């Protein structure tokens, strides 16, 4: 990935052994100027003027960081999932549009065409694979 890692002197809060073994995450953003923000792992860092690249242990860290990049009016932040095979997948936003906005081409997942008091009783679904919330 492209970007400069933000300027701070390191912390004990950063990446642990989970990064090299199963999963690692990364957030990139471009900033109009150099300015101080707060790391999700604790501490003050300075983002660069231009593109950035900061690695994070969890996806939630990048969503908290991109939530406070809204307060600096930086809204081009992208999050990547990184596996130890080198396989980098782009996860957020996944469609290219932020999920708050409706974009076409998005299909319903896990929609139930009923209200919630219309689920079956657990005894009606007992000794089968289905749960009461499943369709």
């Amino acid at each position: 990935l492209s970007g400069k890692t933000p300027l701070f002197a390191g912390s004990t809060g950063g990446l642990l052994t989970k990064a090299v073994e199963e999963e690692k995450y990364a957030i990139t953003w471009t900033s109009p100027k150099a300015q101080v923000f707060e790391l999700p792992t604790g501490g003050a860092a300075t983002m660069h003027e231009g593109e950035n690249l900061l690695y994070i242990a969890r996806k939630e860290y990048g969503i908290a960081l991109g939530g406070q990049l809204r307060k600096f009016k930086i809204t081009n932040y992208k999050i990547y999932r990184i596996l130890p095979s080198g396989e980098t997948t782009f996860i957020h936003p996944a469609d290219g549009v932020f999920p708050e906005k409706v974009n076409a081409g998005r299909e319903k997942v896990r929609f139930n065409a009923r209200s919630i008091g219309e689920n079956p009783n657990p005894s009606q679904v007992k000794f089968s694979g289905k749960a009461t919330y499943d369709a």
Binding site: G13, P40, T41, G42, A57
Partner: protein
Amino acid sequence: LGTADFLIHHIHAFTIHVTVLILLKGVLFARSSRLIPDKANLGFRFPCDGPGRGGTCQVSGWDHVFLGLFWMYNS
């Protein structure tokens, strides 16, 4: 001062250090931990962040003051 006084002064050292652990942990992790990154958005005084992440009850700094009042009492 003798062996009983040695023992009770280390009881005191123990109970103060545990109280300091609870309160210092609540001050250093008041804004964020590994578990909940945006903890300072939730405030100083909040109950939890739901049963997820295994269960996140009493993560706030207030809840560390809560838990540390008992160890202050104990000490």
